Each structure stands twice: as structure tokens, then as C-alpha cells.
């Protein structure tokens, strides 16, 4: 009864739904930011520009959801 029906929780598979939305990679979930609009996950280092730390502010919006 997998948590993610898309990848079936298969650690061998990339998944842009339950892992990094940009690269699909599963590593470093402690460095994957959650977007406060779409609730997808983004490695800090997959962003443009890449970030070296988790932002301090409570609310963060991914490139797909943020104001331009």
C-alpha cells in the first residue's frame, strides 16, 4: 500500500511527485524545501540560483507558484 502511487515507493526510481520536483532525486529530504502553494519539494541546490541553507522565513514559494 505505497505512500506514493506514482513511484510505488521504489527507491530505485526518480519521482517528481514525492521527491524533488525538479530532478526526482530522493536523497537529502532535509534539504528539500516545501512550497507553501503547491506543497511540492525542491532540493535547495536544484533551485536557480541554488541556495546553501533552508530559508529562515516561514513561507516559501517555488518557482512555479511565486510572484514574479
Amino acid at each position: 500500500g505505497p505512500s506514493c502511487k506514482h513511484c510505488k515507493d521504489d527507491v530505485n526510481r526518480l519521482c517528481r511527485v514525492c521527491a524533488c520536483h525538479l530532478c526526482g532525486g530522493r536523497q537529502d529530504p532535509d534539504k528539500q524545501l516545501m512550497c507553501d502553494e503547491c506543497d511540492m519539494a525542491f532540493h535547495i541546490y536544484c533551485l536557480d540560483p541554488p541556495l546553501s541553507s533552508v530559508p529562515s522565513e516561514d513561507e516559501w514559494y517555488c518557482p512555479e507558484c511565486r510572484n514574479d
Binding site: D36, V54, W60
Partner: peptide, 9 residues
């Protein structure tokens, strides 16, 4: 901001 998970220091 929120992260997907946390990790031990």
C-alpha cells in the same frame, strides 16, 4: 521554511 524531512545534527 518547511522542509520535507529533518535530519539528526
Amino acid at each position: 521554511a518547511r522542509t520535507k524531512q529533518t535530519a539528526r545534527k
